[PDB]
Design an enzyme around this catalytic site. Structure first.
Site, PDB file in Angstrom:
ATOM      1  N   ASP A   1       0.703  -1.247  -0.060  1.00 18.61           N
ATOM      2  CA  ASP A   1      -0.018   0.081  -0.222  1.00 18.61           C
ATOM      3  C   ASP A   1       0.816   1.390   0.100  1.00 18.61           C
ATOM      4  O   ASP A   1       0.650   2.007   0.880  1.00 18.61           O
ATOM      5  CB  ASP A   1      -1.083  -0.072   1.157  1.00 18.61           C
ATOM      6  CG  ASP A   1      -2.106   0.826   0.927  1.00 18.61           C
ATOM      7  OD1 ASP A   1      -2.324   1.372  -0.163  1.00 18.61           O
ATOM      8  OD2 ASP A   1      -2.795   1.492   1.943  1.00 18.61           O
TER       9      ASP A   1
ATOM     10  N   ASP B   1      -8.746  -8.599   6.545  1.00 22.32           N
ATOM     11  CA  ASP B   1     -10.351  -9.433   6.537  1.00 22.32           C
ATOM     12  C   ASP B   1     -11.385  -8.793   7.162  1.00 22.32           C
ATOM     13  O   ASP B   1     -12.383  -8.051   6.513  1.00 22.32           O
ATOM     14  CB  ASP B   1     -10.031 -10.660   6.764  1.00 22.32           C
ATOM     15  CG  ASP B   1      -9.309 -11.820   5.845  1.00 22.32           C
ATOM     16  OD1 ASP B   1      -9.346 -11.252   4.773  1.00 22.32           O
ATOM     17  OD2 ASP B   1      -8.924 -12.841   6.397  1.00 22.32           O
TER      18      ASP B   1
HETATM   19  N1  LIG Z   1       2.896   8.109  12.874  1.00 18.79           N
HETATM   20  C1  LIG Z   1       2.256   8.920  12.484  1.00 18.79           C
HETATM   21  N2  LIG Z   1       2.318  10.382  12.585  1.00 18.79           N
HETATM   22  C2  LIG Z   1       1.766  11.263  12.484  1.00 18.79           C
HETATM   23  N3  LIG Z   1       0.697  11.317  11.542  1.00 18.79           N
HETATM   24  C3  LIG Z   1       0.218  10.042  11.325  1.00 18.79           C
HETATM   25  C4  LIG Z   1       0.870   8.807  11.740  1.00 18.79           C
HETATM   26  N4  LIG Z   1       0.143   7.942  11.178  1.00 18.79           N
HETATM   27  C5  LIG Z   1      -0.893   8.233  10.594  1.00 18.79           C
HETATM   28  N5  LIG Z   1      -0.840   9.769  10.587  1.00 18.79           N
HETATM   29  C6  LIG Z   1      -1.799  10.654   9.763  1.00 18.79           C
HETATM   30  O1  LIG Z   1      -2.976  10.185   9.791  1.00 18.79           O
HETATM   31  C7  LIG Z   1      -3.491  10.170   8.562  1.00 18.79           C
HETATM   32  C8  LIG Z   1      -4.692   9.233   8.325  1.00 18.79           C
HETATM   33  O2  LIG Z   1      -3.986   7.816   8.424  1.00 18.79           O
HETATM   34  P1  LIG Z   1      -5.026   6.511   8.263  1.00 18.79           P
HETATM   35  O3  LIG Z   1      -5.878   6.220   9.039  1.00 18.79           O
HETATM   36  O4  LIG Z   1      -3.840   5.483   8.049  1.00 18.79           O
HETATM   37  O5  LIG Z   1      -5.665   6.837   6.773  1.00 18.79           O
HETATM   38  P2  LIG Z   1      -4.920   7.046   5.242  1.00 18.79           P
HETATM   39  O6  LIG Z   1      -3.652   6.463   4.873  1.00 18.79           O
HETATM   40  O7  LIG Z   1      -4.639   8.756   4.998  1.00 18.79           O
HETATM   41  O8  LIG Z   1      -6.053   6.509   4.220  1.00 18.79           O
HETATM   42  P3  LIG Z   1      -6.505   5.208   3.997  1.00 18.79           P
HETATM   43  O9  LIG Z   1      -7.102   4.746   5.480  1.00 18.79           O
HETATM   44  O10 LIG Z   1      -5.259   4.327   3.562  1.00 18.79           O
HETATM   45  S1  LIG Z   1      -7.801   5.192   2.939  1.00 18.79           S
HETATM   46  C9  LIG Z   1      -2.504   9.923   7.525  1.00 18.79           C
HETATM   47  O11 LIG Z   1      -2.912  10.409   6.222  1.00 18.79           O
HETATM   48  C10 LIG Z   1      -1.474  10.930   8.072  1.00 18.79           C
HETATM   49  O12 LIG Z   1      -1.626  12.322   8.028  1.00 18.79           O
END
Ligand SMILES: Nc1ncnc2c1ncn2[C@@H]1O[C@H](COP(=O)(O)OP(=O)(O)OP(O)(O)=S)[C@@H](O)[C@H]1O
Ligand SMILES: [Ca+2]
Ligand SMILES: [Mg+2]
Ligand code: NA
Length: 315
Positions: free
Chosen positions: A152, A179
Site C-alpha cells: 500500500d 479481512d
Molecule cells: N505515526 C504517525 N504520525 C503522524 N501522523 C500520522 C501517523 N500515522 C498516520 N498519520 C496521519 O494520519 C492520516 C490518516 O491515516 P490513516 O488512518 O492510516 O488513513 P490514510 O492512510 O490517510 O487513508 P486510508 O485509510 O489508507 S484510505 C495520515 O494520512 C497521516 O496524515
C-alpha cells in the site's frame, strides 16, 4: 543499502531504549492531544501516553468482533515489534478496547506526504530525490529482513518529520485485520499497479509502480491520471473520472510520465522505469538503488528538514 549511519544507529538505539520503559499499552493510559487525520478504516490521534509521558500517534480502528478474532489480529501485529529501520515508522504496540483496535506508533510531526503536498502545491525534484531513497530503502528493508512487501505505497503512507526523516507506514502485516477491515474499511486502489488490478503477478514490483505514481503526483501537484493537458501544464509550470473508469484507464492506457523541460532527464528516466506496465520489464529495487537519479540524489546535500519546516510552517 541497509547499512546505518552513526546518527541513524544512535536514533534507532534511543527509540528502543524508550520503548523498553513503556510496558503494556492500555486504553486508560492515553490522553488525546489532537486529531492527526482519518481514512478508510480508522482515525489517527496525536496522544500522550500518561505513564511514560511519551507522545505517540494512536490509530483507532473501530471493529465489532469476537475476542477470538480480535486476539488474533493483536497477535499478528506483534511482528511490528521486529520492524526496526530508519525508513519504517516506529511501533509501540497494539491492543483492543471498547470495540476498537489500537495501533500506537512513533509520532511524525511533519505528517504524511499527501498533507505536505497539499500545502506545498508541488514538491521539488531534489526533495523527491530524498523521498525516493527513503522509500526504496524502506521497501528493501521489509523485503530483506522480513520477506515482507508493502502492498500500500502512496503519499498518505509516507511520513516525514522535523528531523528530516522519511518513513513508510501501514504495510499490511495482519491478514485478519485486513479481512475484518475489508468490511466497511476499504482503501483507494488508485495507486495499485496494472498487474495487481488484473489479479495478475504481484510482488515488490507492484510497490515500485505505486512509488513511481506517487512521485509523479508530488512533482506535478496533482494525481497524474488521466494526464494533464498542454493547457494545464501551462498554468502548472508556466511552460471527474469515476473510480472504476480510473482503474480501467490505468490498466488499458499508457503509464503517466513527467512533463519534459521542467524536470531532469534522470528523474524522468527514473519514474519511467518505475512505471513500465510490464512488471517483468519494470525496474526492481536493486536496479533502482543504483539508478543515475538515485546516485545523484544520494550525493546531493539537501536540507530536507529545513525545506519541510518552512513549507508546512513548522515551528
Ligand atoms: N505515526 C504517525 N504520525 C503522524 N501522523 C500520522 C501517523 N500515522 C498516520 N498519520 C496521519 O494520519 C492520516 C490518516 O491515516 P490513516 O488512518 O492510516 O488513513 P490514510 O492512510 O490517510 O487513508 P486510508 O485509510 O489508507 S484510505 C495520515 O494520512 C497521516 O496524515
Ligand atoms: Ca477506557
Ligand atoms: Mg495510512
Ligand atoms: Na478510550
Amino acid at each position: 543499502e541497509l547499512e546505518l549511519d552513526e546518527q541513524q544507529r544512535k536514533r534507532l538505539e534511543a527509540f528502543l531504549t524508550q520503548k523498553q520503559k513503556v510496558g503494556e499499552l492500555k486504553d486508560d493510559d492515553f490522553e488525546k492531544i489532537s486529531e492527526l487525520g482519518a481514512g478508510n478504516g480508522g482515525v489517527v490521534f496525536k496522544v500522550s501516553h500518561k505513564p511514560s509521558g511519551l507522545v505517540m500517534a494512536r490509530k483507532l480502528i473501530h471493529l465489532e468482533i469476537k475476542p477470538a478474532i480480535r486476539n488474533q489480529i493483536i497477535r499478528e501485529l506483534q511482528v511490528l515489534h521486529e520492524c526496526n529501520s530508519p525508513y519504517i515508522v516506529g511501533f509501540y504496540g497494539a491492543f483492543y478496547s471498547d470495540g476498537e483496535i489500537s495501533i500506537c506508533m512513533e509520532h511524525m510531526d511533519g505528517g504524511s506526504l499527501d498533507q505536505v503536498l497539499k500545502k506545498a502545491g508541488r514538491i521539488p525534484e531534489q526533495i523527491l530525490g530524498k523521498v525516493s531513497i527513503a522509500v526504496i530503502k524502506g521497501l528493501t528493508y521489509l523485503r530483506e529482513k522480513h520477506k515482507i512487501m508493502h502492498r500500500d505505497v502512496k503519499p498518505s503512507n509516507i511520513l516525514v518529520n522535523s528531523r528530516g526523516e522519511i518513513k513508510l507506514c501501514d504495510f499490511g502485516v495482519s491478514g485478519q485485520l485486513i479481512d475484518s477491515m475489508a468490511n466497511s474499511f476499504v482503501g483507494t486502489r488508485s495507486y495499485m499497479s496494472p498487474e495487481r488490478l488484473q489479479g495478475t503477478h504481484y510482488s515488490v514490483q507492484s510497490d515500485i509502480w505505486s512509488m513511481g505514481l506517487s512521485l509523479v503526483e508530488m512533482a506535478v501537484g496533482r494525481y497524474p491520471i488521466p494526464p494533464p493537458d498542454a493547457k494545464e501544464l501551462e498554468l502548472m509550470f508556466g511552460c471527474p473520472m469515476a473510480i472504476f473508469e480510473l482503474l480501467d484507464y490505468i490498466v488499458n492506457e499508457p503509464p503517466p510520465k513527467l512533463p519534459s523541460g521542467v524536470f531532469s532527464l534522470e528523474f524522468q528516466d527514473f519514474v519511467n522505469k518505475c512505471l513500465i506496465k510490464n512488471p517483468a520489464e519494470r525496474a526492481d529495487l536493486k536496479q533502482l538503488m543504483v539508478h543515475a537519479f538515485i546516485k545523484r540524489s544520494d550525493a546531493e546535500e539537501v536540507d530536507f528538514a529545513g525545506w519541510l519546516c518552512s513549507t508546512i510552517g513548522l515551528n
